[PDB]
């Protein structure tokens, strides 16, 4: 998600457009983008098209156009030797330009006298001789998460759109494993994140505890071919501040955690640009976004019926798919012109989860389980009184409790959180004093959280496979496999429909080959230079041979390719139709169930307009817009409508006393008029009106007016 | 109690249900519906049913059909370069040929599956009842035909393959193009709809049934909707659940159906379709008196349950949502009736070649006539299949540009022609020199230049 | 059964509105009157109301 958010580029912005003021054909693939802007790539929302990212190879000239690397084909034949051709900053090189997907004769020559080419923004049947330019590769115009698709070549675009994106949203995990079948192109990608740690220079590791690699400030062969050649200003030889640290669990812009275990051994030999420890979710020093598990394609009743996914229990039992998340929580104290308000250990009305898991200032100890209502940090407030109902004075009297005076806005974990506490970060005059003008302490506190997978999580493949968990099956009920190895997801078979993402079976299969062969394999979209699908007879091929390296036999069945038998756990049988099977690389997605859950019996209202305060964090409320009401009055008996319009949103008093009225145990009373009416009066009235809402009563019919 | 031996999946259960409905409660049906989905699932499972690139058969003569089309183009250009024939011309067909093949494929494939698949997926789900469509199953194996460029130019060379083969780049791009366009659109017509309704509902907001009294006996006629001999709508349905201004009178070869005010239930329809009536007159709230609303009686059944509306219901806003919605999915053959050829009556169809020129060639205008509606092409005088005379333009996927090869573009079948200009770019670097025609000068037919 | 009753109820009565409401108020009374008589936690006064209006009344 970084990269692609750096090399993002954008059209909007001051100097640019607006969404509105610019419409459509200004969002399209002007055929010059070719090679320069991954067309596959875009939010949507309105912004489609307004936000592209950068092709892979592109880059820009100091004027700020995108010189496009190519290859000079002489007599219609690239000599290859050429270090590409960094020209063509604009698409009008005007020339024979070849699309970097060419059946190319070994040794230069092109092969087909029907090689297309763009030209003046046109494609054009060309011949091999009279041609200039070939693309460096057939996968340059695309960008990150797009040119990475295992078997791109084989899918709908847009779907692959989705793909890309999903890829950007995969949370990172405890140890995201390098996938199985990958496009080659990534090691790099990782590497340039700068979320990993890279042989700055050179040296043969020495001391490496899990927080740094003193192969660095230690001073031996690491740090010391971090003495081989010895930088301009830098710590040219010694144990050098090539003391890279390495950092554990810091929060992310998504609350995700990151960390880089030493990874490297000790006493050994690294050269610059190599890579030392690993970022969040990268693995062998290379990208690794999610994992890879064995999947089957069948129509599991109900769960999986449609856009639903099953799952074994081992899935997260092996700790796969669980991630971290951690958490900011700050809170602060502040001179009321009543006073300060504070931070005590002490607060009224306490005992367990209060004045218990609490420090002398009512903070927490690092590393404390907490739960959903307990105290983060306790502080009170100069509440006093100066406004009370006699009935309160009573109830004193009876207890004659000379009540206290201090609201007590402790800080409590809200609900649905867990999880150890990592830290705190107090901020006052002495503690940095980073706070609003007049605040005293600020406190941060950080709380983390494993989370296993669990029903309810967008979770998808690298091919727009948006799916949601529904049931988890205890492992001893899934159809397992002929070898009894319980499979464990089970998507819906019928594929490549509107998604047109057949590409993904291809690789499942494949995976499975390198899963049975137990060997990773890189690849690239557009397996051309082959009259036939090419990818198709690879993969078979591999399988094929995968049998016999273990002779397992059911590894590959030419008849019904890669279909297998399957029993099923619950009772113990396959069926008339063998089902494919593969491993496959899935990936789990940030927006997690808890990220969207809500409820409100009732809570805080609005200011002006008192209708519950619906905004997402905090007890919000579902807004019933016109079209929604167009589903109510369109129905039959619509009291509800009514009331819904009021007592659960506005007759103020109405609200309450309803509430009550149920607490009483009976029905509720007739409503009144909502507010926002009354408001409207006001405005209008405040604008040269004489509103007479008014009755016409008596036999003498009586015209009045009202509040 | 009617045992029914039939392959049930999509539609079989659809009308079933209804049937139930009428004849039993809802409640029951529901609980039916249920029990049976429940089947559905569990069997499905039990069958076990997967798909794969291999499962994506290929229709063998994929091949011929195809490269034939190719050599087509060879002729095309033959004279094209040779300036017997030329660019807007031969090219407005190096185009059509493709999309004719496209049908040709459309056929070979389905036809094929139609005669294969012993309960195979593409027959157990697709072809029968499931997300499988054809549309996308065409190019799940078929060859994409031409498509277009960002805007509406149909790019020349079609999208030759499908997704096994996987594209090669260019396409890949092209393909994109589309998809983007599709996209941004979407991003728009979203609103556009919602917008409507919102009007609709506004304009049609409170025609509430107020009132059974009403009055009047006039209505309105109806008749199946019948573009060409294609009759869009079995009158039948169209009758559903209205009230019969007067007596639906069969050819008096029978006697009197449905007097009057007769909420016209289906059965009654389906039959009195099949007493051949032709129109009938049906208390149209387009008339009938009911204050600021439609006569409860002159309204008729409420499709909410196929039973007359209740009362005091704002049918207006309701008639708005109904319309409104689907609006959204305004996208703006199969069962091998024959093959990739369609409604070819007896022998013949007529078009334009000047912007095609490569000899016997052509893009498209309309078609005429003689609609026996049975394999021969277009004419009278009977074909092989089903012999009853008819007459009129006939949708025939395989359209025109003669089969320089396998078909000159079909998948725009048409049972507003403004101008454009012939590139005659320098086809080489040399001493241009025209003659045998030299440009009869003017400022009449071109203008003044 | 209550379900079929609920159906029959309004499968042969006045405006489906008209009914309800009178089912309603009824139960309202069924709740107001007999206030928390038999717990009713299960047979909601509304439910009562329905059955005693879809079978008892019928």
């Amino acid at each position: 998600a970084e990269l692609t958010h750096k090399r993002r580029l954008s059209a909007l912005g001051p100097g640019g457009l607006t969404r509105e003021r610019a419409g459509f054909a200004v969002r399209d693939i002007h055929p010059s983008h070719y090679g320069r802007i991954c067309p596959i790539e875009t939010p949507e929302g309105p912004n489609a098209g307004l936000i592209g990212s950068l092709a892979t190879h592109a880059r820009v000239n100091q004027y700020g156009f995108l010189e496009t690397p190519f290859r000079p084909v002489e007599n219609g034949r690239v000599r290859f030797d050429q270090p590409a051709a960094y020209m063509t900053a604009d698409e009008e090189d005007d020339l024979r330009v070849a699309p970097g997907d060419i059946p190319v004769d070994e040794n230069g020559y092109i092969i087909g006298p029907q090689v297309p080419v763009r030209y003046r923004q046109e494609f054009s049947t060309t011949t091999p001789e009279q041609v200039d330019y070939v693309a460096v590769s057939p996968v340059q115009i695309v960008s990150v998460a797009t040119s990475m698709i295992p078997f791109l070549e084989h899918d709908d675009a847009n779907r692959a759109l989705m793909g890309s994106n999903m890829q950007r949203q995969a949370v990172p995990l405890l140890k995201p494993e390098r996938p199985l079948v990958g496009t080659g192109l990534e090691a790099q990608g990782a590497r340039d994140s700068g979320m990993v740690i890279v042989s700055r220079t050179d040296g043969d590791v020495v001391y490496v505890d899990a927080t740094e690699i003193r192969v660095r400030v230690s001073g031996q062969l690491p740090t010391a071919s971090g003495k081989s050649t010895d930088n301009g200003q830098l710590t040219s030889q010694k144990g050098q501040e090539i003391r890279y640290t390495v950092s554990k669990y810091q929060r992310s812009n998504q609350d995700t955690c990151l960390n880089q275990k030493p990874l490297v051994r000790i006493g050994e030999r690294v050269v610059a640009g190599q890579v030392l420890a690993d970022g969040s979710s990268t693995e062998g020093g290379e990208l690794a976004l999610g994992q890879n598990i064995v999947v089957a394609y069948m129509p599991w009743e109900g769960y999986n019926y449609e856009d639903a996914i099953l799952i074994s229990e081992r899935l997260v039992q092996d700790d796969i798919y669980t991630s971290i998340h951690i958490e900011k929580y700050e809170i602060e104290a502040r001179q009321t012109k009543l006073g300060p308000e504070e931070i005590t250990r002490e607060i009224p009305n306490v005992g367990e989860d209060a004045l218990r898991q609490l420090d002398e200032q009512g903070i927490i100890r690092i590393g404390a389980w907490v739960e959903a209502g307990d105290i983060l940090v306790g502080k009170v407030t100069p509440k006093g009184e100066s406004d009370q109902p006699p009935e309160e004075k009573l109830l004193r009297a009876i207890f004659g409790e000379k009540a206290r005076d201090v609201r007590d806005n402790s800080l409590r974990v809200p609900n649905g959180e867990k999880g150890r506490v990592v830290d705190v970060r107090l901020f006052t005059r002495e503690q940095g004093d980073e706070l609003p003008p007049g605040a005293n302490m600020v406190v941060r506190v950080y709380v983390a959280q494993k989370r296993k997978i669990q029903v309810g999580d967008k979770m998808a493949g690298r091919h727009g496979n948006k799916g949601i968990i529904s049931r988890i099956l205890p492992i001893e009920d899934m159809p397992y496999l002929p070898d009894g190895s319980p499979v464990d997801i089970v998507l819906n078979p019928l594929g490549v429909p509107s998604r047109m993402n057949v590409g993904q079976v291809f690789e499942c299969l494949l995976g499975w080959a390198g899963h049975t062969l137990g060997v990773r394999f890189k690849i690239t979209p557009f397996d051309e230079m082959y009259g036939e699908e090419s990818s198709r007879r690879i993969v078979h091929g591999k399988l094929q041979e995968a049998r016999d390296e273990t002779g397992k036999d059911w590894v590959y069945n030419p008849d019904d390719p890669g279909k297998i038998m399957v029993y099923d756990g619950r009772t113990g049988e396959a069926f008339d139709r063998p089902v494919t099977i593969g491993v496959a690389y899935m990936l789990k997605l940030v927006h997690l169930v808890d990220d969207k859950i809500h409820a409100r019996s009732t809570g805080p209202y609005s200011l002006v307009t008192q209708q519950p305060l619906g905004g997402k964090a905090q007890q919000g409320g579902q807004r019933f817009g016109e079209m929604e009401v167009w589903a109510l009055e369109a129905f039959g008996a619509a009291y509800t409508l009514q009331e819904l319009l009021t007592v659960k949103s506005d007759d103020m008093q109405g609200r309450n006393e309803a509430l009550n009225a149920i607490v009483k145990g009976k029905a509720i009373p007739r409503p009144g008029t909502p507010e926002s009416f009354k408001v409207l009066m006001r405005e209008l009235q405040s604008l040269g009106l004489d509103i007479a809402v008014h009755k016409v009563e008596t036999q003498a019919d009586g015209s009045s007016l009202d509040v | 109690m009617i045992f029914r031996n039939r392959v049930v999946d999509k539609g079989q259960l659809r009308n079933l249900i209804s049937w139930a409905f009428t004849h039993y409660g809802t409640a029951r049906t529901a609980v039916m519906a249920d029990k049976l989905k429940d089947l559905g699932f569990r069997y499905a499972t039990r069958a076990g049913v997967s798909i794969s690139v291999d499962d994506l058969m290929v229709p063998p003569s994929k091949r011929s059909l195809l490269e034939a089309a190719e050599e087509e183009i060879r002729a095309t250009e033959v004279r094209y370069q040779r300036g017997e024939i030329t660019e807007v011309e031969r090219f407005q067909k190096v185009i059509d040929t493709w999309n004719g093949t496209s049908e040709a494929l459309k056929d070979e494939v389905v036809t094929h599956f139609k005669q294969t698949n012993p309960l195979n997926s593409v027959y157990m789900m697709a072809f029968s009842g499931a997300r499988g469509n054809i549309s996308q199953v065409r190019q799940l194996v078929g060859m994409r035909g031409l498509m277009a460029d960002p805007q509406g130019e149909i790019i020349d060379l079609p999208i030759k393959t499908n997704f096994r083969e996987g594209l090669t780049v260019t396409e890949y791009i092209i393909s994109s193009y589309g998809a983007r366009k599709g996209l941004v659109d979407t991003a728009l017509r979203t609103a556009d709809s919602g917008y409507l309704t919102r009007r609709l509902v506004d304009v049609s907001q409170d025609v509430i049934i107020r009132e059974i009294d009403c009055g009047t006996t006039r209505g309105i006629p109806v008749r199946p909707m019948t573009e060409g001999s294609k009759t869009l709508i079995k009158l039948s349905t169209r009758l559903l659940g209205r009230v019969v201004g007067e007596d639906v009178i069969h050819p008096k070869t029978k006697e009197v159906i449905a007097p009057r005010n007769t909420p016209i239930s289906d059965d009654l329809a389906k039959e009195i379709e099949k007493a051949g009536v032709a129109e009938v007159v049906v208390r149209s709230p387009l008339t009938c008196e009911a204050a600021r609303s439609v006569c409860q009686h002159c309204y008729g059944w409420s499709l909410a349950h196929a039973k007359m509306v209740d009362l005091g219901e704002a049918v207006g806003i309701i008639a708005a949502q109904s319309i409104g919605e689907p609006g959204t999915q305004l996208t703006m053959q199969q069962v091998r009736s024959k093959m990739d050829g369609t409604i070819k009556l007896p022998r013949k169809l007529r078009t334009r070649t000047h912007r095609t020129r490569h000899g016997e060639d052509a893009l498209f205008v309309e078609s005429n006539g003689i609609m026996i509606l049975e394999p021969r092409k277009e004419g009278s005088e009977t074909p092989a299949p089903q012999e009853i005379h008819v007459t009129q333009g006939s949708t025939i996927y395989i359209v025109d540009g003669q089969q320089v090869k396998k078909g000159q573009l079909l998948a725009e079948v048409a049972l507003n022609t403004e101008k454009a200009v012939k590139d005659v770019a320098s086809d080489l670097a040399g001493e241009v020199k025209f003659a045998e025609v030299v440009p009869e000068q003017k400022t009449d037919r071109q203008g003044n230049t | 059964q209550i379900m079929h009753r609920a159906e029959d109820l309004i499968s042969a009565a006045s405006n489906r509105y008209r009914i309800t409401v009178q089912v309603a108020n009824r139960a309202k009374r069924r709740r107001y009157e007999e206030f928390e008589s038999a717990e009713d936690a299960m047979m909601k006064p509304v439910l009562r109301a329905i059955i005693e209006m879809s079978d008892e009344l019928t």
């Binding site: 008996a637 009291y639 409508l641 409503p671 | 907001q205 409170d206 509430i208 | 008209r18």
Partner: peptide, 21 residues
């Protein structure tokens, strides 16, 4: 009528307005 009763709270030409009426 309707659309106001809503705007406004009270209920609808139908409902009790159609029952009591």
């Amino acid at each position: 009528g309707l659309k106001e009763n809503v705007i406004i709270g009270r209920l609808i030409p139908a409902g009790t307005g159609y029952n009591t009426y």
